[PDB]
């Protein structure tokens, strides 16, 4: 059954997609939050 | 688990061991009433390896003092953190230094280094896996010069095993302080050879340098000019107090770094230095950091390493950063200037990672290099030394002490002998 | 039932161990305490209610990197006498690792293995991993080696071991340790996988667009490969592939079993978003000399036997049209004395991704397990690299003051001389 | 099933694809992104779920143009890995550009190349476009047709190319590239089209009320001509015809493959309504000197092969009646050994507007392909103006510094002149 291998596609390759693009999404946040604790050391640099 | 115990000798050494705990109980977090007090759990799974602890939360660091006269204590105890040192570890004579080596050697050494090794006994057995001993003394009056060698000779003697390392300062080629540092240099340098396993040499003119070029400090006093060689001791350690991608102890170091017994003396390099106004122009990150490592104006050694031929080097970094990165810098910088390493030891460069930064840097990175640029700094003062003996008569001073002649002799001759090796190892 | 046993030793093997139970957690489906929120016997010991507890053992003379995991989120899924801890560094000093520390904590990890191994009554195999350049993976690895070779006899010891980058190097020492690491398992290791960073530096910059890797990304791709390696022995398949299969096929002779890998498709997540990635394009992918982990050109040398493992929806027709394809290729060379060359193995279990990870959305993933003769380029540059410090006799002193007798030099010298004979005179035709 | 693949060098190749990409998507109805709100092989291949991607590769050692497209609107279609920039142009110098710049991202490309074409089996021909006074356009594309030539072999490899203008020029160098270009053109090409950038000028405003065209007017243009030829392969027709069947009948000698292109009716959107537009206008049109594509009369020259190729409502009773009509016309000679000269064409699907754009809405059109002995007036001027430079020796040390040998020079001159005794002796009555 060609149908199954296509459900098994959405379920493995597609469905995992939607997960990982999460991540990447995940992957947004986390540089955001590298800039902020390197921003943040950063005045408290400038403070000393 | 490889605690570290700490001596300091004489002014110099008391000086710089003063700031050289200021850094790193203020790295740790330590109140000056001796009280932990920090914000991060980090800095308390290690503490063990520099601070003693005491009934009540209070915490006293393994260091021992010496010295001849009274009056560098009494700065010590009238500092900021003078208060956090036990008071029973202060040991001392009631005689002036004698800006002599052979009077600190033979006269009161003998009658201080009992008392001496008994103290640093009681802070050995404090310690289950004490790595090593750290001294830090200058070369160039008589008293860090003198007692230290006696002293470390005594500390080989009863631990062959563990790890002797010294931060010395050696007498400057144009600012030297007094008439007769060639001999207290040349006699030290005899002990200092066979005993310690690893020597770091530090320059004063170098440090000068150094301020006035990239600190842009009008007025430097000994505060400043000490804390860049805390920054160095502080970062050499590293690896044992925090953790890091890749740690690096000093009997790792002593390994890679040293090819032959006698060839053991170092030269030392820190980074990042920037003037309090030009920070706002840099974009610190690796490459820049390996640029100033290797620019021979922050070598704190006066000694030109582009004249001589490099030996195995290691560089240690601190914070956060790309393995693949430094790896790249240390390949880059190996291939790109070949003719200053010797061809038939590849992979010159040492690399290491440590994860927590210092206080305020986003990064930090320590160099430690072993090249035959040394000869120069022992040309110079050989050379002073010849024509310093060459008036036979001034050896005087010494002979009332007990110094025969022949010693002055056999000193040259050996470090002579240094000499031709590291020419010998040049091609 | 069946069974499988890992042995982690110094600051690389833990780090990488680290993050193949990431990936097993989640694939196997478990709370990081190792409560559940089948194959679990395989790789966890059930211990009673709904617990379970992984069989590895993690030894290191650092007792930094174990006191990390001590301290760790996972610390509660390992059980506190897994975790072996000693005093100091081996100084990257083979003969430091060998005699005078190794031997004060051999005994205490040899007990706990033998503990381990009681329970796991349906075991096969063992799995090491070692970083060469350290003094502790090669000092206290040929130890351990040499002692589990005579206890436990007829068992798989399957090993897996970071080779020397042929430029980049951290340790000066590192050629030394290397070849005397070399002697030891060329003589006690049934097939030992290899593996140098620099290869995966440029992978990991090249085929995913990930701005400065550390080693975590490394130890991640490090983790997909021995699950797919394993994942024959925890899913069903139309083809399963045993450990003995391995060591029949992946060697044709003795001293030759040292083996290459590749694993295929490395792609990052917006990329396959704009491919489609069939059967044929990531069978493709493997034999280009880009995707190889150790930075040797197959081209130089030739091809005597291939595995490939395949994971998720793959079908017997496309995975005989893709090797058919791939024979038909004259820039693969093969000796004539081994036509077949090649056994395929099918499993339909998915590979599983990492929450915030590397690697892409691949329903069909393809691993690559082969032994080439292009191996002996490394093995001249390490031959090359030890002679120009034994010539100076550049670092005698340290090794000859911890025990270790000079005279065991020239030996590993002539080993690895042997074994470069053993090589060309294999990929000799008649 | 049966592809194409199109390959593009320097800001001529990227430009012209960038409108006949936008032509193209519409006309087969697929957005920007690849998804939808058949004969998709033809330059699309297929992905996972809805998304497509063109089976194109964009070569140019300039990123300018490049990082356009991938900050342009139809970035989502196009996969990243088939835009390849380079660091530095050639600089106008086809020596730089064949040697030192394009030796350096030569196999890159080559390897995309081919990858590409695994998933085109059915591949028929490549698409390969130049600019010939340019430095990329002409170094790079003689680099890999070189190339081409061995790893295909008997392929069908048809070129685009931008044949520098009678007068106008913007290069002081353009005669140099040229020459060397058509050196190694004629050689290894299949059969290579010509247009150049003067009539386009004229024709855009001659044809349609447009005062001021630019580039992006001149290349809707070409667009439409290369939708025209491969409209066959695209969609039913009462006439199929294959590119190898354009390759028998256009050329009857190998170095005179050169053929000549123009398009009718090309009418501004309210001109249309004004006129039938019928077939006998269509076909009696296109043999004007107005239309034609190249500034070359043909008056001047003689016809030895046409090819015509329709979309509309064409009736063949009336394709019969239009050429029997032209042959009748007495300014129109031909070769008496090539007594038909003629292969007609007839597809049903019309041609598709693009909204804000130049045509009109016409219900039928054709397109034109010919073969004559007028281009012969065009190598001449070109032939004049390179003895003029080379007499004084112009701008021989710039090409010499860049690897070039000098004695090529004489070589490439020594072609052109036998091109030029070839094309008169095969005009030549008996
Ligand atoms: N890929 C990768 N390699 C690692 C990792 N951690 C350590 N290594 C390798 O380990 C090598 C050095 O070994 P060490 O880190 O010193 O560990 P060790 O075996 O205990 O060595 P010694 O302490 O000197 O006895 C380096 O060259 C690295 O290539 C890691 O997380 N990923
Ligand atoms: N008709 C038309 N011609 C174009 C277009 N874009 C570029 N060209 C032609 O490209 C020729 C030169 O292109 P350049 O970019 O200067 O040179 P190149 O071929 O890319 O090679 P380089 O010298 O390395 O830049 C000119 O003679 C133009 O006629 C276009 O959009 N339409
Ligand atoms: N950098 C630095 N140098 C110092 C300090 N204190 C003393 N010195 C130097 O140490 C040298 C000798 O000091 P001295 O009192 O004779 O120490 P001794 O060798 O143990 O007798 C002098 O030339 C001083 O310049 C200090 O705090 N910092
Ligand atoms: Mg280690
Ligand atoms: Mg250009």
Request: hydrophobic residues 35%; glycine residues 8%; proline residues 4%.
């Given at each position: 059954?060609?149908?199954?291998?296509?459900?098994?596609?959405?379920?493995?390759?597609?469905?995992?997609?939607?997960?990982?693009?999460?991540?990447?999404?995940?992957?947004?946040?986390?540089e955001?939050?590298?800039?902020?604790?390197?921003?943040?050391?950063?005045?408290?640099?400038?403070?000393? | 688990?490889?605690?570290?115990?700490?001596?300091?000798?004489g002014?110099?050494?008391n000086?710089?061991?003063?700031?050289?705990?200021?850094?790193?109980?203020?790295?740790?977090?330590?109140?000056?009433?001796?009280?932990?007090?920090?914000?991060?759990?980090?800095?308390?799974?290690?503490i063990?390896?520099?601070?003693?602890?005491?009934?009540?939360?209070?915490?006293?660091?393994?260091?021992?003092?010496?010295?001849?006269?009274?009056?560098?204590?009494?700065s010590?105890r009238?500092?900021?953190?003078?208060?956090?040192?036990?008071?029973?570890?202060?040991?001392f004579?009631?005689?002036?230094?004698?800006?002599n080596?052979?009077?600190?050697?033979?006269?009161?050494g003998?009658?201080?280094?009992?008392?001496?090794?008994?103290?640093?006994?009681?802070?050995?057995?404090?310690?289950?896996c004490?790595?090593?001993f750290?001294?830090?003394?200058?070369?160039?009056?008589?008293?860090?010069?003198?007692?230290?060698?006696?002293?470390?000779?005594?500390?080989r003697?009863?631990?062959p095993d563990?790890?002797?390392?010294?931060?010395?300062?050696?007498?400057?080629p144009?600012?030297?302080?007094?008439?007769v540092?060639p001999?207290?240099?040349?006699?030290?340098?005899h002990?200092?050879?066979?005993?310690?396993?690893?020597v770091?040499?530090?320059?004063?003119?170098?440090?000068?340098?150094?301020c006035?070029?990239?600190?842009?400090?009008?007025?430097?006093?000994?505060?400043?000019?000490?804390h860049?060689v805390?920054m160095?001791?502080?970062?050499?350690?590293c690896?044992?107090?925090?953790?890091?991608?890749?740690?690096?102890?000093?009997?790792?170091?002593?390994?890679?770094?040293?090819?032959?017994?006698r060839?053991?003396?170092?030269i030392?390099?820190?980074?990042?230095?920037?003037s309090?106004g030009?920070?706002?122009?840099?974009?610190?990150?690796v490459?820049?950091?390996?640029?100033?490592?290797?620019?021979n104006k922050?070598?704190?050694?006066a000694?030109?390493?582009?004249?001589?031929?490099?030996?195995?080097?290691?560089?240690?970094?601190?914070?956060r950063?790309?393995?693949?990165?430094?790896?790249?810098q240390?390949?880059?910088?190996q291939?790109?200037?070949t003719?200053?390493?010797?061809?038939?030891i590849?992979?010159?460069?040492?690399?290491?990672?440590?994860?927590?930064?210092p206080?305020?840097?986003?990064?930090a990175?320590?160099?430690?290099?072993?090249?035959?640029?040394f000869?120069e700094?022992?040309?110079?003062?050989?050379?002073?030394?010849?024509?310093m003996?060459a008036?036979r008569?001034?050896?005087?001073?010494?002979?009332?002490?007990?110094?025969?002649?022949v010693?002055?002799?056999?000193?040259?001759?050996?470090?002579?002998?240094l000499?031709?090796?590291?020419?010998?190892?040049?091609? | 039932?069946?069974?499988?046993?890992?042995?982690?030793?110094?600051?690389?093997?833990?780090?990488?161990?680290?993050?193949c139970?990431?990936?097993?957690?989640?694939?196997?489906g478990?709370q990081?305490?190792?409560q559940?929120?089948?194959a679990?016997?395989?790789?966890?010991?059930?211990?009673?209610a709904?617990?379970?507890?992984?069989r590895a053992?993690?030894?290191?003379?650092?007792?930094?990197?174990?006191?990390?995991?001590?301290?760790?989120?996972?610390?509660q899924?390992?059980?506190?006498?897994?975790?072996?801890?000693?005093?100091?560094?081996?100084?990257?000093?083979?003969?430091?690792?060998?005699?005078?520390?190794?031997?004060?904590?051999?005994?205490?990890?040899?007990?706990?293995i033998?503990?381990?191994?009681?329970?796991?009554?349906?075991?096969?195999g063992?799995?090491?991993?070692?970083?060469?350049?350290g003094?502790?993976?090669?000092?206290?690895?040929?130890?351990?080696?040499?002692?589990?070779?005579?206890?436990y006899?007829?068992?798989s010891?399957?090993?897996?071991?970071?080779?020397?980058?042929?430029?980049?190097?951290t340790?000066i020492?590192?050629?030394?340790?290397?070849?005397?690491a070399?002697?030891?398992?060329?003589?006690?290791?049934?097939?030992?996988?290899?593996?140098?960073?620099?290869a995966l530096?440029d992978?990991?910059?090249?085929?995913?667009?990930?701005?400065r890797?550390t080693?975590?990304?490394?130890?991640?791709?490090?983790?997909?490969?021995?699950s797919?390696?394993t994942?024959?022995?925890r899913?069903?398949?139309?083809?399963?592939?045993?450990?003995?299969?391995?060591?029949?096929?992946?060697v044709?002779?003795?001293?030759?079993?040292?083996?290459?890998?590749?694993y295929?498709?490395?792609?990052?997540?917006?990329?396959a978003?704009h491919?489609?990635?069939?059967?044929?394009?990531?069978?493709?992918?493997?034999?280009?000399?880009?995707?190889?982990?150790?930075?040797?050109?197959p081209r130089?040398?030739?091809?005597?036997?291939?595995?490939?493992?395949?994971?998720?929806?793959?079908?017997?027709?496309?995975?005989?049209?893709?090797?058919?394809?791939?024979?038909?290729?004259?820039?693969?060379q093969?000796?004539?004395?081994?036509p077949?060359?090649?056994?395929?193995?099918?499993?339909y279990?998915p590979?599983?991704?990492?929450?915030?990870?590397?690697?892409?959305?691949?329903?069909?993933?393809?691993?690559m397990?082969?032994?080439?003769?292009?191996?002996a380029?490394?093995?001249?540059?390490?031959?090359?690299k030890?002679?120009?410090?034994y010539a100076?006799?550049?670092?005698?002193?340290?090794?000859?003051?911890?025990?270790?007798?000079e005279?065991?030099?020239?030996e590993?010298?002539e080993?690895?001389?042997?074994?470069?004979?053993?090589?060309?005179?294999?990929?000799?035709?008649?």
């Amino acid at each position: 059954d060609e149908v199954k291998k296509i459900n098994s596609e959405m379920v493995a390759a597609k469905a995992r997609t939607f997960r990982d693009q999460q991540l990447e999404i995940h992957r947004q946040m986390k540089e955001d939050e590298k800039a902020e604790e390197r921003s943040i050391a950063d005045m408290l640099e400038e403070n000393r | 688990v490889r605690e570290i115990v700490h001596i300091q000798a004489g002014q110099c050494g008391n000086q710089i061991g003063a700031k050289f705990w200021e850094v790193i109980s203020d790295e740790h977090g330590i109140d000056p009433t001796g009280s932990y007090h920090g914000d991060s759990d980090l800095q308390l799974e290690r503490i063990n390896v520099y601070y003693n602890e005491a009934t009540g939360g209070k915490y006293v660091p393994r260091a021992i003092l010496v010295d001849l006269e009274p009056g560098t204590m009494d700065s010590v105890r009238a500092g900021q953190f003078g208060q956090l040192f036990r008071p029973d570890n202060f040991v001392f004579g009631q005689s002036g230094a004698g800006n002599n080596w052979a009077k600190g050697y033979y006269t009161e050494g003998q009658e201080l280094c009992e008392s001496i090794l008994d103290v640093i006994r009681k802070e050995a057995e404090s310690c289950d896996c004490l790595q090593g001993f750290q001294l830090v003394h200058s070369l160039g009056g008589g008293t860090g010069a003198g007692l230290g060698t006696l002293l470390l000779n005594k500390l080989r003697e009863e631990y062959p095993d563990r790890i002797l390392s010294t931060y010395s300062i050696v007498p400057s080629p144009k600012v030297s302080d007094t008439v007769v540092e060639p001999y207290n240099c040349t006699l030290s340098v005899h002990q200092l050879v066979e005993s310690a396993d690893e020597v770091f040499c530090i320059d004063n003119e170098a440090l000068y340098d150094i301020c006035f070029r990239t600190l842009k400090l009008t007025t430097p006093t000994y505060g400043d000019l000490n804390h860049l060689v805390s920054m160095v001791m502080s970062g050499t350690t590293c690896a044992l107090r925090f953790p890091g991608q890749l740690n690096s102890d000093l009997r790792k170091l002593a390994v890679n770094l040293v090819p032959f017994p006698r060839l053991h003396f170092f030269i030392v390099g820190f980074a990042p230095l920037t003037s309090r106004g030009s920070q706002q122009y840099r974009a610190l990150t690796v490459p820049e950091l390996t640029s100033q490592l290797f620019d021979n104006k922050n070598m704190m050694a006066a000694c030109d390493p582009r004249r001589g031929v490099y030996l195995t080097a290691s560089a240690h970094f601190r914070g956060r950063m790309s393995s693949k990165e430094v790896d790249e810098q240390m390949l880059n910088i190996q291939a790109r200037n070949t003719s200053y390493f010797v061809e038939w030891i590849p992979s010159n460069v040492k690399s290491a990672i440590c994860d927590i930064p210092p206080r305020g840097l986003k990064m930090a990175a320590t160099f430690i290099g072993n090249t035959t640029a040394f000869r120069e700094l022992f040309t110079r003062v050989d050379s002073q030394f010849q024509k310093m003996y060459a008036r036979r008569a001034f050896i005087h001073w010494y002979v009332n002490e007990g110094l025969e002649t022949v010693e002055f002799d056999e000193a040259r001759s050996n470090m002579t002998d240094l000499i031709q090796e590291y020419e010998m190892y040049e091609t | 039932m069946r069974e499988v046993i890992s042995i982690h030793v110094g600051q690389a093997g833990v780090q990488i161990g680290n993050g193949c139970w990431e990936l097993y957690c989640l694939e196997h489906g478990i709370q990081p305490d190792g409560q559940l929120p089948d194959a679990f016997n395989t790789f966890f010991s059930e211990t009673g209610a709904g617990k379970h507890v992984p069989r590895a053992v993690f030894v290191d003379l650092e007792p930094t990197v174990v006191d990390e995991v001590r301290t760790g989120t996972y610390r509660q899924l390992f059980h506190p006498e897994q975790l072996i801890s000693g005093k100091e560094d081996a100084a990257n000093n083979y003969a430091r690792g060998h005699y005078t520390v190794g031997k004060e904590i051999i005994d205490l990890t040899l007990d706990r293995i033998r503990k381990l191994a009681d329970q796991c009554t349906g075991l096969q195999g063992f799995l090491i991993f070692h970083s060469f350049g350290g003094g502790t993976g090669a000092g206290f690895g040929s130890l351990l080696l040499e002692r589990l070779s005579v206890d436990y006899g007829k068992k798989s010891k399957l090993e897996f071991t970071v080779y020397p980058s042929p430029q980049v190097s951290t340790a000066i020492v590192e050629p030394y340790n290397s070849i005397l690491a070399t002697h030891s398992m060329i003589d006690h290791s049934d097939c030992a996988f290899m593996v140098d960073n620099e290869a995966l530096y440029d992978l990991c910059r090249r085929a995913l667009d990930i701005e400065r890797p550390t080693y975590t990304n490394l130890n991640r791709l490090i983790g997909q490969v021995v699950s797919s390696l394993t994942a024959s022995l925890r899913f069903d398949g139309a083809l399963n592939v045993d450990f003995t299969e391995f060591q029949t096929n992946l060697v044709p002779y003795a001293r030759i079993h040292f083996p290459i890998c590749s694993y295929a498709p490395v792609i990052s997540a917006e990329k396959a978003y704009h491919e489609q990635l069939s059967v044929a394009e990531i069978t493709n992918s493997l034999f280009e000399p880009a995707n190889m982990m150790v930075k040797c050109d197959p081209r130089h040398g030739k091809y005597m036997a291939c595995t490939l493992l395949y994971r998720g929806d793959v079908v017997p027709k496309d995975v005989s049209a893709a090797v058919a394809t791939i024979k038909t290729k004259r820039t693969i060379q093969f000796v004539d004395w081994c036509p077949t060359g090649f056994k395929m193995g099918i499993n339909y279990q998915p590979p599983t991704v990492v929450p915030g990870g590397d690697l892409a959305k691949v329903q069909r993933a393809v691993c690559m397990l082969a032994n080439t003769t292009a191996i002996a380029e490394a093995w001249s540059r390490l031959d090359h690299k030890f002679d120009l410090m034994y010539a100076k006799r550049a670092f005698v002193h340290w090794y000859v003051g911890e025990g270790m007798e000079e005279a065991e030099f020239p030996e590993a010298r002539e080993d690895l001389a042997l074994l470069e004979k053993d090589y060309d005179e294999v990929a000799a035709e008649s």
